[PDB]
Amino acid sequence: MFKAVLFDLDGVITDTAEYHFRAWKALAEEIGINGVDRQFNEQLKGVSKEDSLQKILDLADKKVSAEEFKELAKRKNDNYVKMIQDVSPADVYPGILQLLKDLRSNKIKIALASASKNGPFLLERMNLTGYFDAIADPAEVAASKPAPDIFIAAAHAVGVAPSESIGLEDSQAGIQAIKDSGALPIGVGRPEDLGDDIVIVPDTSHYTLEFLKEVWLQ
Ligand SMILES: [Mg+2]
16 A cells, blocks of 8 residues: 655645735736736746746836846735735645545555645644645755656655655646656546546545545556
């Protein structure tokens, strides 16, 4: 049987994308730029702050100094930290709390493998910290997803090899990272998005201990 489950945070445990979106929209509004909506935000998800801010400035063809660029980036981050003060156990995705309980009661290790710089904070606000054996620190990993580094770090931090683990992700880059780590991916979302070569479930309510066991046995 697998010995650990390695979780991403956004799109598996909870929705942090909402709060990044709100932070960018608030920034864009503060400086009088229109067009930062949920569709435009698809060009901001999972890219650097620099890239994101470039794209936003381009909406109005706005030029900035290096000093102004740095201030705007800081402002977005401050906005984000303010907006996540709201997070509560009400923000946990369906099935996830029961899955953590079941994993823990079956002595399976639980690790977070997220690029979030606020992962410990978020897990504390959602009252999930107690279930986590480790949180991989993205500050201490050399390469982001789709590189396998953060999944290797998460597995190692609970004393297992990635080949002893299942990874749960909703993103192409995350699924690729799990595959290249040696862990078994189980995706959540659409095969159209994540590929035909992995087990995919339509939403997190399908992530049950019994399902993960059956997938492992294949
Ligand atoms: Mg994710």
